[PDB]
Amino acid sequence: IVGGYTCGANTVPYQVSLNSGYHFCGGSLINSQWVVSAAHCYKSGIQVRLGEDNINVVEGNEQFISASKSIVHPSYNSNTLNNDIMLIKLKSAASLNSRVASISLPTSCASAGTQCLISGWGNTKSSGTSYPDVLKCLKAPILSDSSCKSAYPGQITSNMFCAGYLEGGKDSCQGDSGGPVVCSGKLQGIVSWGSGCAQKNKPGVYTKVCNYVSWIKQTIASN
């Protein structure tokens, strides 16, 4: 997160960190056994880390659970990043409390102008590299489809949306992928791609989770 603020410990209780020796992506806990992430975050040997604040320090509220299976979207497009959505099953059910909590899936898609919360442990700089250890948060609005396409001509499918600021200075960044965009208490987005970070006219592009509610529901039902 570039331009953000320190969330506070466990204030984003659905935020998970994905670990393979190091933090590589985020994800969002949607029930006690399943995490939503980006399909480009696919890796073998994933451990989900819940309850986290400083990811380099065990602070006593963490739960570390290995992934037992990963389900990348059947139509995930590697070249275009269309259908950038993945399901990860926890090998043991997480214990849900005030600091490790599931996040609701949308019943309806979010509209342009709606304010969302974006979070992650990614880079804090739009030029150079500084990685926070504590979780960062960004309040950013959904941008019109029109605004998104004009920023990224020919790159925006119906399974994407832009959120953030055309002026620059406030965005998600590398290390934030897979993590939540939550608006009105529903998981409306997944941190996906951009050109650089927090650059003028280069807003963040996110997976439009509302298009995936029925594949999520049926997939978890039979796995």
Binding site: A38, C41, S172, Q174, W193
Partner: protein
């Protein structure tokens, strides 16, 4: 460098590199990356040539 290079079949051709890489990227001007570690980056520039592999 470029491995996968499709081109329109006009004169001149309009070509781009659809290689996904990590580095991004001096020769390239328009380069989109996923927000993971490492990033997955593409050059979405369209040119005359390819380049070679």
């Amino acid at each position: 460098c470029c491995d996968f290079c499709p081109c329109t079949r006009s004169i001149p051709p309009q070509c781009q590199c659809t290689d996904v890489r990590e580095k991004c990227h001096s020769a390239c001007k328009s380069c989109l990356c996923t927000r993971s570690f490492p990033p997955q980056c593409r050059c979405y520039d369209i040119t005359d040539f390819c380049y070679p592999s």
